Design a binder for this molecule. Sequence first.
Ligand code: FAD
Ligand code: BOG
Ligand code: BOG
Ligand code: BOG
Ligand code: BOG
Ligand code: T3A
Ligand code: 2PG
Length: 495
Amino acid sequence: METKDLIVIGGGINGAGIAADAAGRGLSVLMLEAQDLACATSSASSKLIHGGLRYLEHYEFRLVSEALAEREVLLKMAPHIAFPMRFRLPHRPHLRPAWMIRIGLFMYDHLGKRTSLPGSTGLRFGANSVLKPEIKRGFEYSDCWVDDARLVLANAQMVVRKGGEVLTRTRATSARRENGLWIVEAEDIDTGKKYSWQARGLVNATGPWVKQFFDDGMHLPSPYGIRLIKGSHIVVPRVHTQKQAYILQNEDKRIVFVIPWMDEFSIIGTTDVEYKGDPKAVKIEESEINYLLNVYNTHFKKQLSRDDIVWTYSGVRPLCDDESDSPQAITRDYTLDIHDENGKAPLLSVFGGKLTTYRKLAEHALEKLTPYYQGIGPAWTKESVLPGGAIEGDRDDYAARLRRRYPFLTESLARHYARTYGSNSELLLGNAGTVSDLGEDFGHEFYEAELKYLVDHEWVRRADDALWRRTKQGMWLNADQQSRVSQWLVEYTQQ
Ligand SMILES: Cc1cc2nc3c(=O)[nH]c(=O)nc-3n(C[C@H](O)[C@H](O)[C@H](O)COP(=O)(O)OP(=O)(O)OC[C@H]3O[C@@H](n4cnc5c(N)ncnc54)[C@H](O)[C@@H]3O)c2cc1C
Ligand SMILES: CCCCCCCCO[C@@H]1O[C@H](CO)[C@@H](O)[C@H](O)[C@H]1O
Ligand SMILES: CCCCCCCCO[C@@H]1O[C@H](CO)[C@@H](O)[C@H](O)[C@H]1O
Ligand SMILES: CCCCCCCCO[C@@H]1O[C@H](CO)[C@@H](O)[C@H](O)[C@H]1O
Ligand SMILES: CCCCCCCCO[C@@H]1O[C@H](CO)[C@@H](O)[C@H](O)[C@H]1O
Ligand SMILES: O=S(=O)(O)CCCNC(CO)(CO)CO
Ligand SMILES: O=C(O)[C@H](CO)OP(=O)(O)O
């Protein structure tokens, strides 16, 4: 023993969040991630902690109420990476009558417990707005932005903090019951180092891969189909200077967001495209671009073309197959399935599960796993504060506090540290007292002290883990800057 209580296969948000909860109820936990933390669906989201306004139409009150209540729990768990945002809904009476918006916005206000977040209001649009002349009315309400990939990272660190282990670049190849225990086989994707562990419990939280892990990894029947529903986002220099997001009603009845991103960009997403194939292959297609530019350009005065696009990303939603004919109508609710064999070796397996609802999901999963452990502590995460979160304030509150303590910090660098690392910033900065104490400037104030900290504390192994997942510095570093980051990581992860 050697025998872990629980193996979690999966390090997106649902695997990390399950493993974090388990470790904090006393279980020995190993979370296995085939590639990098959040390398798939959990870094390809719209980055919102939202209730799911559009899901009210489809009468999804269990999900929408749970997700609304979670916005505020998540704001306190991670105030370094999560924050309130306001969403502007332009009125399109030919699509949805005002009286209908007002009922939904009323429900959005009261279906979950809502202290901090303001309520909705009506809006008018003048000759001087960002929107087209003919659009005269709208609405405004609350929801939250989160740094998806950093929420995943925070949870992995919670695992380790609480005594668990987390292996990345380690692909589970098989899992089988023997003699009352799981035998989990995994393998290092680079070297080829084989591993084998026994555990009392197995979570299959492999997102879009959940059913193919049943088929190829376990030779067991999957309790559910998964529908893979691709969505893509485009990125442009910001379309306007407003702080608020816009949520646009399209002719097909879907909604599309224009979201301020990192003070310089806007994100426009997303799409619902039925998908077959390898979830790692997923990338935006021409018609997704055409579709997103269109709904933008029909609403807004400042027009965008294709040539304005600076970045795109794409991902596949692993949606519990409710056999719904239309991809936009398939449920965004999750399903968890627990099964033992002779009252021992449970298999908990995860189907669906928005980032918003992950802490709820993790909790229910441990609920179902309780019978098979001791011994096991109770629920606890609602009242936790994830690593990085111990700041109380943020928005220079923490960044100004840091520039105070570390006066050689530029205001941009302190904002970045505060909004990325939070309360882990002093750990990064160590014994630095000047800028040259930070080491090699890799570009855009991305210094060797940040990159080394990422390797030492954040499982960074390759340039992209650092530049696209733990941060979004890859938005500013040029091709040679990025390969120097890779070159450095080679030298340091030698050796
Ligand atoms: C376009 C889009 C926009 C979205 N926007 C939002 C939003 O705004 N708000 C919100 O709350 N949610 C949003 N979501 C939903 C959310 O992103 C997903 O539900 C969530 O990220 C899925 O996480 P997961 O852990 O279940 O899957 P993942 O963690 O992403 O997938 C499983 C992970 O485990 C690893 N893995 C897989 N198989 C193995 C194996 N065999 N062995 C070892 N490791 C393995 C992978 O390498 C993979 O990264 C969005 C989703 C999409 C697609
Ligand atoms: C009891 C009468 C039934 C009315 C259904 C209420 C749900 C309305 O939901 C509405 O539609 C869209 C998607 O949900 C959103 O864009 C709107 O803002 C939202 O209010
Ligand atoms: C006469 C215009 C009143 C409101 C100012 C902006 C116009 C767009 O608002 C309109 O108001 C209607 C009443 O006719 C609502 O029922 C509709 O949903 C909408 O078409
Ligand atoms: C937020 C107010 C309580 C909700 C009551 C539903 C009445 C909304 O009804 C709508 O009101 C709009 C603005 O007056 C009008 O433009 C529309 O014609 C009307 O359908
Ligand atoms: C089939 C789906 C349509 C059902 C809606 C009822 C039709 C009446 O239509 C609307 O109803 C609202 C409340 O019902 C009122 O506030 C509006 O003033 C009225 O225009
Ligand atoms: O700092 S934490 O303790 O929260 C996580 C530390 C992880 N360190 C690794 C360094 O090799 C990953 O970066 C692996 O244990
Ligand atoms: O653009 C979006 O938000 C869509 C549907 O309009 O998807 P989802 O609900 O999965 O995030």
